[PDB]
Enzyme design. Structure first.
Site, short mmCIF file in Angstrom:
data_model
loop_
_atom_site.label_atom_id
_atom_site.label_comp_id
_atom_site.label_asym_id
_atom_site.label_seq_id
_atom_site.Cartn_x
_atom_site.Cartn_y
_atom_site.Cartn_z
N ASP A 13 0.91 -1.18 -0.04
CA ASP A 13 -0.29 -0.22 0.01
C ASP A 13 0.91 1.20 0.15
OD1 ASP A 13 -2.58 1.51 0.40
OD2 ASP A 13 -1.56 1.98 2.19
N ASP A 38 -9.30 -2.18 1.63
CA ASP A 38 -9.36 -1.33 0.14
C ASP A 38 -10.67 -1.78 -0.34
OD1 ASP A 38 -7.04 0.06 0.71
OD2 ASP A 38 -5.81 -0.96 -0.88
N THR A 51 -3.88 5.35 -3.80
CA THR A 51 -3.04 6.18 -2.99
C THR A 51 -1.40 6.19 -3.67
OG1 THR A 51 -1.76 4.50 -1.54
CG2 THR A 51 -4.09 5.49 -1.04
N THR A 52 -1.32 5.43 -4.92
CA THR A 52 -0.14 5.70 -5.57
C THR A 52 0.05 6.20 -7.12
OG1 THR A 52 -0.49 3.28 -6.59
CG2 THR A 52 0.78 3.36 -4.55
#
Ligand SMILES: Nc1ncnc2c1ncn2[C@@H]1O[C@H](COP(=O)(O)OP(=O)(O)O)[C@@H](O)[C@H]1O
Ligand SMILES: Nc1ncnc2c1ncn2[C@@H]1O[C@H](COP(=O)(O)OP(=O)(O)O)[C@@H](O)[C@H]1O
Ligand SMILES: [Mg+2]
Ligand SMILES: [Mg+2]
Lengths: 521, 529, 351
Positions: free
Chosen positions: A58, A388, A91-92
């Site tokens: 993550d 997630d 989130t990346t």
């Protein structure tokens, strides 16, 4: 020079060089998490000062565990945290997007261009992109009662495709969907319990439509009372049941030994009064957040009952929600409407531990997960992966629009922005062009992580999109391009919308800073 | 080699580490240099095109801002003259609430010109008297430049346009949205025959989506959770207590003393029965929600859950008073069934979630209410802090407009006109104080110049064209920001205005600070500790 | 709720208070900027007893800082946790007492006690119902002892029936830092007896002999001695600051602990807190008086006090009442009475 303006040790930097340095630092931050994207993404291991280790895929977690102290770089951590808070997935992509936005306009900054023009161009491009995403997203008004579960299953399967539990995604997705079909209308995340038991295979995980929790500390006599019931009534309590002083403020003054004996008998009479009031209600299982004494334990054992003490508050609230009673702080009125009702209660051996199971409640607004692994970080990563999917399913239930993944929407937006840029004159054209070219870092990273030739795939994708193929992205297994809407790679549009807004905001904030000042200490 | 031992007298009686500066060369000029450095520090953040600045204090906290007062607060200045300038700026911020950079720019310009006036031959007293005469003349001239007094301060579409200029210089590119939000929030609570109080506007920051999802709420929001099992109400009668929601006891030490068994058995039942009676008596008045400022007991919570009463607690001693004002309730120091006059009323009370944050909302269907709240959404804490500062500037502008309704043109038109008329006045003064007066007028050209320097154009052409067009009789012509070549524009037509009172106080405080700095002749400093 | 204000006087008092407040703030979640970032609301059930809440969310201590020399406030402001205090609560003079009791009590104190009394009035105006005061000072100095005693007397005059507790350091047995230490200690105990409810005497050498032998590693300065004293004070005041199985303010400890009003001196302890009415106090005073007489018989250094306004009989009254205190303590053991003066003469006839 005799007396100086500021305190000694104040460090100041200004001009183009400090902006270029900030842009350089953002590149390092983005590189830290660059190769964790896609179906072929690795994961990182981080060790802290004490020696404990943590293994994660993550992006937000990895950015959190890095002790970043650069003021321009902290913005990329902040936007990742914000994206995690709002939507829970993606989130990346936002970090790579922000870094690419900065890197594509670095050369213009080097030439001496006023940053406010760059900011205006970014704002216009972001507005256009968000409007396009809202326009082309696919939705169904009255879909079905069965075509409304399949969509959530596809969303969860896509959300799990790059995690440690990818091979069993079809097994896990189903479960999580069920988990969110029982969570009322507020969809509280505290209504889903996650329990992690060492030892076992990943296919031995289970979901209980009910409640389960660990065994608590017990006194003598606990092993002489039954451990299975078929139609029990549950008494949920917040009362301490043991021989103790009535009040800390109490004090007894007495003159005769007869009254001494009467006082001695009074405490036993009080405790037994509470126990008979509990017993006569018909309950077979009692639970309490407060301790249960050994006298109460033996009293319940002698009448074929089950007791537990010091139950965690969250587990007791979860039991209330699953079975349908109410926590009682007093035993003076234990009616039939304040007791719970389950269909099976059991105590079972799970890999070295003892677990209490309440199952068989069809009126339950609660489910519980039991995860089986082989090491602590294994179950921790499993839980992080499931979170997630849970968040994605919650977001998909409300707004139900879906766009194709794999990079199709990135290339569609890039084509749209490039077609728009040729209309307007000036430096706005070059800036919109740079913004359009910065959007294809996602398919390039997918191909690079997979191990393909990114140039050929990107050329084929650009040709396919310019002609006509709205939903065409990369096929990782066949090493080619393919339609990602018929291959069932779906994701909600909120992810892309929020990612674009956050990345643009971070880029605009970083560009508009002129100088940096550091005070001593 | 030899040494220069010391001078007899004061030089030999001085302690170790102390310093003594005397004369013009060692005291006045060094102060002027320090003030010039301070002014150049913050010059670059002036106007709509001023760039942001990033400061880290000694506790490793991060600030990204454009406001000058915040920047000066976060820095650590050591020179006394810069301390006087900072104190003048802070006084201007407290008195008005906007225009803390005009003070620094004007004071720096005044001292810079006084340096060359002293160099050429004039004395400090003559410079001072010229500065006072020019300041009085400027204050006399200013009321004649007023245009477009505010008409109605409870019309949303006029208030939104009046506050746009004060926010354009902080959030260029987002002025319309924030202006409309602040206009709604301010028009909500302005009372009739009312002083507008500034405290009655609250700001809540929740991490989440972009700025464009911000909103305004007529009521209150707390970042708390409900204590009981009731979660929502649809028509709320509210009872508020400042005492703990528990059985209340003697102030002096008290002990329960029992002598027989029956008392020991009956004590707990007596307490429970009393607590039940109290809760039922409170509930029978019709209250649905109880708000307390202290601890809640377990038995009291159980009886509240029995009778379907929503229970919320908050411990600030200030949020309680603001809530009492919001709902029209009166706090009670006793646990007694309240009277109808002490009932608060609320249209809706509910527990909601916004972007991972759980909140409790007291919401009105009314349009006025007593206070209102602004909910801000952003991707970064620093961005939301900057937006909050802009909101504060806008609210202070509304308050000043309430105090006085007169506006003057902005963008440098007022400063150019003031400089022109002051020079014309000074050309008719026979004596040595004319030079100082002229310098005063020239000090007004630092405001347009800075703007041009931030816009990326040549200041000399802009100033020349402004002078040329003001010679013809256009008093409302200032700098044009949109154009990439230097140009001029009519400010009254384009709606660029600023308050009369802010300019008045800025000129007054800047001149006062400059003269005070000029008056010091010698400095004695103790050793730092 | 039943607020307490804290007063620090002198260099030693300021040094001890600066760590007392530091070790309290970390318990309640306060930050050096004044904000709050705690987790458990159990910290906020009794937060108002020691902190006053300002508009905007800040918390400021209910403290007043006093000295006759501006040296120590500059360190306090420039040190750690020295920016949460109210800037208007610093009171200082310009000269200093120079370890003279008379100057602190008569000449320099009289022109500054009014400022302290005007600050305590504003700090008391903001509390709903105050219950008492905390004082930290020293018995071997001039500002700490004489000025502190004058302040105690003035507070007792202005606030009649509010409790008062002191945390006073005491002279060491085998080492005296100041030549006139017996005079200051004897002249301050006289008015500590009749104007306080309890006193917590702390010795420098006794606690100083813990870092070398128990802590296993030190060659320290006043430093860690001060931190240990602050830890002792926090362990004392946890009952006031926090709720527990049985919470009790210092009055509810004194009433169980102090049977006789004039015997209200204690000796602390610490085992990671112990407070005891050990009569080993009678050993300390017996030493101090032993020094006092030894000097007073020679009239040594007397002219330094007489010139400031004091009279010769004040010393006589102070020593008489010190002897009275020692005898009152001795009358509780009946075992030290066995050590009477050995008889030296030979007259043991008929009767
Ligand atoms: N089956 C698939 N084929 C191709 N691409 C996929 C597939 N499943 C997921 N992806 C891509 O993986 C990318 C995200 O990987 P991930 O590590 O989840 O990043 P993030 O957490 O930022 O979404 C998405 O851009 C998505 O398009
Ligand atoms: N649209 C505009 N065009 C030109 N100047 C403007 C505009 N809006 C505001 N200004 C100018 O910005 C100046 C003040 O901006 P600001 O940075 O807030 O300084 P201060 O904080 O000292 O008021 C005002 O003098 C005003 O003339
Ligand atoms: Mg992902
Ligand atoms: Mg301004």
């Amino acid at each position: 020079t005799p007396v100086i303006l500021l305190k000694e040790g104040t460090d100041s930097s200004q001009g183009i060089p400090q902006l270029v340095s900030n842009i350089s630092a953002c590149q390092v931050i983005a590189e830290a998490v660059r190769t964790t994207l896609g179906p072929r993404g690795m994961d990182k291991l981080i060790v802290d000062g004490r020696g404990k280790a943590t293994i994660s895929n993550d992006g937000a977690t990895i950015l959190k565990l890095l002790d970043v102290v650069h003021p321009a770089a902290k913005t990329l951590v902040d936007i990742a945290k914000s994206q995690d808070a709002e939507v829970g997935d993606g989130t990346t992509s936002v970090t790579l997007l922000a870094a690419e936005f900065l890197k594509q306009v670095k050369p213009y900054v080097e030439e001496g261009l006023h940053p406010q023009i760059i900011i205006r161009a970014f704002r216009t491009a972001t507005q256009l992109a968000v409007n396009k995403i809202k326009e082309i997203a696919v939705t169904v008004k009255k879909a079905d009662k069965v075509e409304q579960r399949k969509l959530l299953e596809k969303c969860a399967m896509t959300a799990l495709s790059s995690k440690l539990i990818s091979q069993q995604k079809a097994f896990f997705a189903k479960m999580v969907v069920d988990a969110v079909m029982m969570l009322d209308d507020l969809l509280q995340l505290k209504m889903i319990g996650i329990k992690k038991v060492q030892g076992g295979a990943l296919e031995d995980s289970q979901l209980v439509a009910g409640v389960a929790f660990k065994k608590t500390f017990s006194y003598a006599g606990f092993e002489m009372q039954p451990k299975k019931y078929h139609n029990p009534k549950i008494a949920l309590l917040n009362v301490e049941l043991e021989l103790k002083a009535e009040k800390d403020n109490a004090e007894i003054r007495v003159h005769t030994v007869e009254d001494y004996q009467a006082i001695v008998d009074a405490e036993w009479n009080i405790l037994y009064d509470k126990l008979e009031k509990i017993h006569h209600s018909g309950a077979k299982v009692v639970l309490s957040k407060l301790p249960i004494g050994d006298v109460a334990t033996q009293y319940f054992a002698d009448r074929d009952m089950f007791c537990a003490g010091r139950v965690p508050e969250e587990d007791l609230k979860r039991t209330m929600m699953a079975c349908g009673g109410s926590i009682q702080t007093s035993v003076n009125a234990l009616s039939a409407d304040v007791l719970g009702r389950c269909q099976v209660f059991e105590e079972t051996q799970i890999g070295g531990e003892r677990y209490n199971f309440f199952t068989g409640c069809p009126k339950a607004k609660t489910c519980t997960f039991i995860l089986r692994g082989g090491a602590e970080q294994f179950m921790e990563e499993t839980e992080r992966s499931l979170h997630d999917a849970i968040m994605i399913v919650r977001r998909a239930i409300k707004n139900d629009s879906v766009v194709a993944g794999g990079g199709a929407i990135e290339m569609e937006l890039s084509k749209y922005l490039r077609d728009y840029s040729r209309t307007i004159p000036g430096k706005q054209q070059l800036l919109i062009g740079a913004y359009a070219k910065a959007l294809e870092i996602i398919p390039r990273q997918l191909c690079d992580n997979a191990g393909f030739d990114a140039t050929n795939i990107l050329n084929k994708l650009r040709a396919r999109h310019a002609q006509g193929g709205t939903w065409y992205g990369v096929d990782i297994n066949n090493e080619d391009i393919a339609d990602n809407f018929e291959a069932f790679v779906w994701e909600p549009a909120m992810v892309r919308i929020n990612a674009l807004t956050a990345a643009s905001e971070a880029a605009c904030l970083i560009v508009s800073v002129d100088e940096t000042i550091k005070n001593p200490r | 080699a030899l040494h220069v031992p010391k001078a007899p007298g004061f030089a030999q009686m001085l302690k170790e580490g102390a310093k003594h500066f005397s004369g013009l060369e060692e005291a006045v000029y060094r102060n002027i240099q320090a003030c010039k450095e301070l002014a150049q520090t913050t010059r670059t953040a002036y106007g709509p095109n001023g760039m942001n600045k990033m400061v880290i204090n000694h506790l490793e906290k991060l600030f990204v801002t454009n406001d000058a007062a915040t920047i000066l607060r976060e820095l650590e200045v050591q020179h006394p003259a810069a301390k006087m300038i900072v104190m003048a700026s802070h006084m201007q911020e407290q008195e008005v609430g906007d225009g803390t950079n005009f003070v620094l720019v004007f004071a720096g310009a005044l001292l810079e010109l006084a340096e060359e006036l002293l160099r050429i031959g004039l004395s400090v007293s003559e410079v001072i008297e010229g500065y006072e005469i020019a300041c009085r003349k400027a204050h006399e001239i200013l009321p004649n430049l007023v245009c477009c007094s505010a008409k109605n301060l409870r019309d949303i579409d006029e208030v939104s346009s009046l506050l746009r200029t004060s926010i354009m210089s902080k959030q260029y590119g987002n002025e319309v949205f924030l202006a409309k939000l602040i206009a709604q929030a301010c028009v909500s609570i302005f009372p009739d025959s009312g002083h507008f109080n500034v405290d009655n506007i609250r700001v809540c920051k929740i991490l989440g989506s972009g700025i464009s999802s911000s909103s305004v709420l007529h009521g209150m929001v707390f970042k708390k959770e409900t204590e009981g099992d009731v979660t929502s109400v649809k028509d709320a009668k509210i009872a508020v207590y400042s005492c703990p929601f528990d059985g209340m006891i003697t102030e002096t030490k008290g002990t329960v003393l029992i002598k027989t068994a029956e008392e020991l058995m009956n004590f707990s039942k007596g307490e429970e029965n009393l607590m039940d009676a109290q809760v039922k008596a409170i509930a029978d008045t019709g209250a649905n929600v109880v708000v307390t400022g202290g601890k809640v007991a377990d038995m009291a919570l159980h009886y509240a859950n029995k009778y379907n009463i929503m229970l919320v607690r908050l411990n600030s001693k200030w949020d309680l008073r603001r809530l009492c004002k919001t709902v029209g309730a009166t706090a009670l120091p006793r646990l007694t069934p309240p009277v109808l006059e002490e009932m608060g009323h609320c249209d809706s009370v509910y527990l909601s979630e916004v972007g991972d944050t759980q909140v409790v909302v007291f919401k009105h269907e009314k349009e006025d209410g007593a206070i209102s709240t602004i909910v801000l959404r952003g991707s970064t804490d620093n961005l939301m802090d900057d937006i909050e500062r802009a909101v504060d500037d806008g609210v202070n502008t509304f308050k000043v407009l309430t105090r006085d309704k007169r506006l003057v043109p902005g963008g440098g038109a007022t400063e150019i006109e003031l400089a022109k008329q002051i020079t014309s006045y000074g050309e008719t003064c026979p004596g040595l104080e004319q030079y100082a007066i002229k310098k005063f007028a020239e000090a007004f050209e630092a405001i347009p110049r800075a703007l041009a320097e931030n816009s990326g154009v040549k200041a000399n052409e802009v100033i020349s064209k402004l002078y040329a067009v003001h010679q013809e009789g256009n008093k409302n012509v200032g700098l044009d920001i949109e154009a990439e070549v230097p140009a001029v524009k009519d400010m009254l037509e384009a709606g660029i205005l600023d308050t009369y009172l802010g300019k008045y106080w800025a000129i007054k405080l800047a001149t006062n600070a400059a003269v005070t700095v000029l008056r010091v002749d010698q400095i004695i400093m103790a050793k730092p500790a | 709720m039943r607020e307490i204000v804290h007063i620090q006087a002198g260099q030693c008092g300021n040094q001890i208070g600066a760590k007392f407040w530091e070790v309290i703030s970390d318990e309640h979640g306060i930050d050096p900027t004044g904000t709050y970032h705690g987790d458990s609301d159990l910290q906020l059930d009794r937060i108002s007893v020691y902190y006053n809440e300002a508009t905007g969310g800040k918390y400021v201590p209910r403290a007043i800082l006093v000295d006759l020399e501006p040296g120590t406030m500059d360190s306090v402001r420039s040190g750690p946790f020295g920016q949460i205090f109210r800037p208007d609560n610093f009171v200082f003079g310009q000269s200093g007492a120079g370890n003279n009791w008379a100057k602190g009590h008569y000449t320099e104190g009289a022109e500054l006690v009014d400022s302290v009394l005007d600050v305590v009035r504003k700090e008391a105006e903001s509390c709903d119902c105050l219950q008492g005061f905390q004082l930290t000072h020293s018995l071997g100095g001039g500002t700490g002892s004489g000025m502190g005693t004058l302040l105690i007397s003035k507070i007792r005059e202005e606030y009649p029936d509010r409790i008062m507790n002191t945390f006073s350091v005491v002279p060491s047995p085998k080492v005296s830092d100041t030549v006139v230490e017996p005079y200051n200690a004897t002249l301050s105990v006289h008015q500590l007896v009749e104007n306080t409810d309890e006193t917590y005497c702390i010795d420098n050498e006794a606690l100083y002999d813990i870092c070398f032998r128990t802590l296993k590693l030190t060659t320290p300065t006043y430093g860690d001695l001060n931190h240990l004293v602050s830890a002792t004070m926090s362990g004392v005041t946890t009952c006031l600051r926090f709720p527990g199985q049985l919470n009790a303010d210092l009055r509810k400890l004194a009433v169980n602990m102090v049977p006789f009003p004039r015997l209200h001196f204690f000796m602390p302890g610490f085992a990671p807190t112990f407070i005891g009415n050990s009569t080993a106090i009678q050993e300390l005073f017996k030493r101090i008086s032993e020094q006092f007489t030894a000097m007073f018989r020679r009239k040594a250094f007397l002219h330094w006090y007489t010139g400031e306004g004091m009279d010769e009989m004040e010393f006589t009254e102070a020593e008489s009442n010190m002897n009275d205190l020692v005898s009152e303590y001795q009358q509780y053991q009946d075992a030290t009475a066995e050590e009477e003066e050995d008889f030296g003469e030979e007259a043991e006839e008929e009767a």
